Amino acid sequence: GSAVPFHGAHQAGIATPVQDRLHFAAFDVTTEDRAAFVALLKEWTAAARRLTAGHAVGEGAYGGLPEAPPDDTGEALGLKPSRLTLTIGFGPSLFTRFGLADLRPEALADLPKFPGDNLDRARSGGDLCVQACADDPQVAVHAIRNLARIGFGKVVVRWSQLGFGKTSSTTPDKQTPRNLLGFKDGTRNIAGTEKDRLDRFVWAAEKDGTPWMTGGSYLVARRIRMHIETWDRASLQEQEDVFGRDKGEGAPVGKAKERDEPFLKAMKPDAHVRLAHPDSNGGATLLRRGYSFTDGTDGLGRLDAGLFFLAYQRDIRTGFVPVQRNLATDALNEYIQHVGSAVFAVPPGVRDADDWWGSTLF
Amino acid sequence: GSAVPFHGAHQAGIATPVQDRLHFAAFDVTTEDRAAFVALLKEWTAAARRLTAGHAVGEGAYGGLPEAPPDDTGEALGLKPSRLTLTIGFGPSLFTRFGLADLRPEALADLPKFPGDNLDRARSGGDLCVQACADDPQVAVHAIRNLARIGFGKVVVRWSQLGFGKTSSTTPDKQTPRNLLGFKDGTRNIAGTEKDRLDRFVWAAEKDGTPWMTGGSYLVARRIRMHIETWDRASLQEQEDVFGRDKGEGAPVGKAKERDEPFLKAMKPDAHVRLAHPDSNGGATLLRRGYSFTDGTDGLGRLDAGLFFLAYQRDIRTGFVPVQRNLATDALNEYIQHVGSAVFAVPPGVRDADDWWGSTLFG
């Protein structure tokens, strides 16, 4: 139930241990006034300091003037911080406004089309995002609701995604969670303690060519539907062959333990792990941080189910793009479909109490 | 606690402690064959015994024949029982099948149309329900996913709702939860400790007229959307006047503490608590066991959130119906809309290892 520190060289919610719940919102900007937008970033930063410490925003949730609406909507009263993190990003579309055109980073690349894509335009893109993660769903909803309320008239919610359970790990010392296909997901990631690998593969550097992004990262989001009817009639051997790991322990094929190193040549040539592994991709490595979802039924008698895939990396061109290209022949493609997509530049950390989200850009 | 016993005179998940998460599913039946349906109820009961004890269904999630599909889909491996309960109920539409029309209980009454209803037919009704409650949502989802798979060919999923209450790891057991309007919700309710009040207001008795339902209960489900953005623009005074309790402490107006008994005359005439109280409804009293929901945002950018309301009672005609009828002029109506509805007869408990869901009805 403890708090995660809000200030630092980097934003929290990336290398941080993965929390149980997600509420992700993408927003579009409705104001043309640069100064008004800056004022919103400052007000949102102030609110974030309160929320991540388990305090109400502004003057509180009750005990003000009877004839005014409360500053805080009140549904998190009496709850602990619950490891809430709030992570902001800026989409490519933002840079067509406020005179920002020449400051768009090269590393913030538009994704190509991928075979099998079926992207809903309404649940794709966005001028900016807020990733709220916490162990308590009510704490996460409260944060997004209050940020949206504060921004009324300057931003609107484009689309949102809730994740009921995590399917990722930045803590290899703890149990790896399972996705809705029944397999462990997160064994070979990047850990929060691996400072050298984070500098190499996740954090942007000054020399990369965009000074305001130093200490930030780049985010790819992919909404992925799972064909669970089709999966659930596959044999055990078919399921295991698709991944290259066994289902029970999650060990590489032939080996006894989850964390034994994969021997790729023992896997089928189209196995997911074999195609996705850094050694198959010129060393390309990602920080995966996704969550499972279910949004009701499909109207055809079945549960809906999916995975909201999130990856962080130092440059989209050298991270997600080469890996996803190599997945063109993946055995897993028979059972999944990508139906939503977005990319964001995740700025550096809020250094101290005088700093604000986006200060290096603006 | 870790696990809740599956067997008893009553089904678990009604009077047993309230768990942090919900997955509620309504099913429609596709077979006309009574024998095939009974076989399914037996298979489902066997699965439920395994799920509620934290075990995999059938021969397990791995380690069987490589060329066969696993019996269990595997996504709850390594998790705890998480206080899972599985509660089954039968809708009015089930009784048009299998020659059951004369065994429909009179207490399983069709609901009238209420003012302001805007019911989505696709998220209403159903032949059957399973209420899965647990502290971990993946445990609840796994249960529904595997029941649906076992039943494939005989039942389909009509509609499904996820919900959340408190998170028990971080929040004390005696603290009343708040709903998404920011008010404490559950202060004056029937508690599972109140054996006599359960006998008077919740459990069906033999003399009530339907012998197979003795020790069962009747369930009403309502999916109630809140107009979040409108509510959040209301003044503090307006919000408190809507309920008749204050927002910070949740005390009745003119009182100091949450659990102080209300004085109805100090509240506005159309305040929610005043209209819903038993003294305003001839003594009618309900067990509320509902969960908050947040599903996402709609096409206009608004939050799709609310209360998935669940009420158990001895008779729908003397529980939910009179109380909801009295809310015709509720001040809360400005901020909510009922968008889904269903009613179910929840049979008595599974007595022992040889019993099965629905045995008193089917024989």
Ligand code: HEM
């Ligand atoms: C529904 C979609 C997906 C499922 C169910 C899935 C499942 C898995 C599983 C079970 C593992 C093995 C355990 C582990 O090391 O984490 C794995 C590994 C991996 N996946 Fe996926 N995955 C999916 C989509 C993706 C996508 C879209 C990407 C990147 C474009 C990706 C990249 C990886 C990587 C990099 C690994 C680690 C390989 C290694 O270094 O050993 N996955 N995935």
Ligand code: HEM
């Ligand atoms: C979104 C919908 C609703 C909200 C936000 C809501 C909220 C509340 C709140 C805050 C209380 C006071 C604290 C407490 O005793 O629990 C309350 C009490 C109550 N509500 Fe509602 N409620 C809703 C719908 C309903 C419906 C549909 C019914 C019944 C048909 C109902 C029946 C009651 C009852 C019986 C009480 C207890 C009154 C007493 O004995 O003091 N509520 N509700």
